[PDB]
Amino acid sequence: NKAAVVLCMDVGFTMSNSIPGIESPFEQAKKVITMFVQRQVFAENKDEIALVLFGTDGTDNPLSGGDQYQNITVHRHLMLPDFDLLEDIESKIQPGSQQADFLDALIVSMDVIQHETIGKKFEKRHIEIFTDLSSRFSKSQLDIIIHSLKKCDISLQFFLPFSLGGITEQQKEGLEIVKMVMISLEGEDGLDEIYSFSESLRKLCVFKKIERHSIHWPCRLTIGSNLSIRIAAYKSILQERVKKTWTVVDAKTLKKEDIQKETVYCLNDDDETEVLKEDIIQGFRYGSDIVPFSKVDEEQMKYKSEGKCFSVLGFCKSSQVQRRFFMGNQVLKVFAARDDEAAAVALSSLIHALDDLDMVAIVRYAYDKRANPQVGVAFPHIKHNYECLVYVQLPFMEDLRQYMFSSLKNSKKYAPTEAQLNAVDALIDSMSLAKKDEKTDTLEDLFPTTKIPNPRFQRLFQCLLHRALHPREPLPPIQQHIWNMLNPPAEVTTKSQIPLSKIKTLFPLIEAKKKDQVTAQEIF
Amino acid sequence: YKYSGRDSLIFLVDASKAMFESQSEDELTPFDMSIQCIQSVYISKIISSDRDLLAVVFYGTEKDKNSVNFKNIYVLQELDNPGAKRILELDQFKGQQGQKRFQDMMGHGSDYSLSEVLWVCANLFSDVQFKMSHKRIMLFTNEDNPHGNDSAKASRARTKAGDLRDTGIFLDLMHLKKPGGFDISLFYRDIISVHFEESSKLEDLLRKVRAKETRKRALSRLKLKLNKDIVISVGIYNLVQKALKPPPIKLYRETNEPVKTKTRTFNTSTGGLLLPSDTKRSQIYGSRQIILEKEETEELKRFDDPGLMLMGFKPLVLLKKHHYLRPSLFVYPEESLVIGSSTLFSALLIKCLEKEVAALCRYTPRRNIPPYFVALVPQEEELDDQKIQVTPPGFQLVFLPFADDKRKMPFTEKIMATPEQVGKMKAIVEKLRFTYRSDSFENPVLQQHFRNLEALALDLMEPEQAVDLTLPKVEAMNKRLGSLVDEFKELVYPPDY
């Protein structure tokens, strides 16, 4: 995809004025679009943004008029976002003393999309209207607009100051007019293009998830010498790392190429400097002495895989494969090849014949030529929309460590007494996250840690934001909502305090030391 | 024993003609058997534990080398860390020509005395400076009465070997197929800690087995903060950790000497050997450049101090086994800090197993690392194999992904097979049933690598080329399975491929 975005923002007078328990509808919308702009300001998507202001005391548009096409400024054209747009959003924008129409701004904005979408490429398109419903209008072009939103293929998102579960009669009637427009566009799904400033500030709280694909890999799943099936796996969990590395730069010039990194060499006989292209040969180490290989004779003797293989070795129970031992960098999801309906029936047979025996597969793998051969467990599971069979690496005999940890049931010197046991008996029920508020036999899932975004990247982009908008100032604390997300606090801490209070007495708590920081010489 | 103590091991062969040049067959030779043993345990110890010490000694030879108590003994090698040139010294004495090569030098069949031989080895272990965890002697003699014809010779040995055992040096034995008989109950009964052909132990010294063996050591120690206040010390131990070919040491071509990689940073314009303070770190975004110091690219990525914070409890079923992050690590108590905290941990272990529960924690292994989230699954020991503890009791740290880790995967929908297409598969699968065990496989590369390395190192005529165990043995898969691939080819898809 390459997207179009058009922020269509009401800046009339009235949205400055409010229900006193909130920020003004003007600054609420300004904050929403701030909390948005930041996202693609960092994320490397190919998406163009435009700004349109309406209720402006002047006007600037390609389509200017006296009553319609008026009190509108097409403030920023449809291109990739940048920090100056974010500064102008955060600090420049003003309410007009006058008023204007969102149907008005919509026609101009939609015509600007009809200009911009020709001379440069796109796939999907949006228009986004933010207002307090102070627009007064004739219900003019609406059927042609809804028809044209299909013929231009642009969806409309609409943003408002109040709830969908003290507002003016003008806001109630305006919302029924917005409903009527989205019912006309999309029917029952259409109202899910409508958002409150309340729920959206309570949803735009964070930077984006890092967007990455798993690359395609074509292969041939092979249960025996004659029988092969087409397979194409995708990585599914990968412990994810940031795209752009920290570049190295001179302190006064700020140019990323005024440093050259000389990896020079020394023999220790008073600084005889070697040439790597002639005189340096890798060695390995063999007991009390070194032995020279050649990098060019290791390749003569090295174990070479005969192919880019995937082939099953045999099968055995879930019992043969305990939890602990799993050893991988990644998990694959190992799927029937695209548009192979023979593979689709054959692999659905394979995994449906593993669903019932508790049997698992054991498989030789190799991603590509020269890379290391590989072993392990191709473990099946089921979801209503597809069969799962993940592949995971398992240890070789030298990857596995065996130690006799002194075994704890010999409890005579480390006594677990009746009163200690009768304290713990309440802890581990009392501090439950999973609560039984259900009849599905699935508990509330009160802390869904696999849905949380990585605090490492939230923290990184949050610093890059602050040092972009305040370019010589010191770094901020952790933004507080990150702790509020990363804790597990609410009702569980209200339950815990008393069962924890009897741990403090029934168990001993002998000392540990502490260590210091820049506090070892910092003020007050 | 304690962590640092080296294993140390001394090999002590009978040079006497009556065994040395002797055979009942032609097909082996007791000296050629012992020397093979010494070269083969020694090539095991080179790959596996370069830190542990070997020596080798000939007793009853005719030309001598000792510190003192000299008569008729030759220390071929004093105690040392093992390597190639030592294996080359033993190689010289091997084989039919070898049993003449030895004769031109140290000389054969002369009278000997175990009470002096045990003296010599004692002085050897004494002479070394290192801390030793196991001190062991290996007897390669067949001479079942060790010429105790003089009982007042022999009582010296038996008392001296009392003194070996009393000083906590151990001693160990192998019998070597003496013609017609060998019986420990005549003599050696009190030297070791009904009748034999040749030792069932000795084949274990020919296993040639290769891995690093790295002893029980912590990864780190941490405090399991239950809240703002209650803490227990726990260890963090590495039960499963992928091995690598050892890091290669860059060398000077013309002399084989090691050389220093000696890197610097240099200004592209000018002679400035730029110091770490001269240069910052940076990014590019939105056509502008963001600048941070070499302190703060690592002040960012801080959140917490080293510990484990408790986050509340879950059902073990909701910890779905499809999403898995990195290898699981063990948690086990440590009275080294927080004394008596073992009393709490043990109750916590016991009672979680009743509740069918995990603890959820947030985990930082160091200062300046972000917290991951980890489920503490509780664990229980299968001692039923005569106290071979296949599984230690404690907790597993099992790591959990975050949103960013769970990568999007393309659209697909189907529920395609019929009950016959499953039904034929349910046969082939049950025909291909074996038993996996964790140790049943070995790395094809890393095993091959050592064999190449030996050929180069001991100067062997060939790489041993020992074929791997990961390839499917396809003719057995043809036969055990049989012809049933045709059930897919007929019942399930058309003949066009």
Partner: peptide
């Protein structure tokens, strides 16, 4: 004690002889 502990490399548990698939 003796039963599980290797004579080549003491204290450490005996390395069993590689295995692989066999039915």
């Amino acid at each position: 004690r003796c039963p599980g502990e290797s004579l080549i490399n003491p204290g450490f548990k005996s390395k069993k002889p590689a295995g692989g698939v066999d039915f």
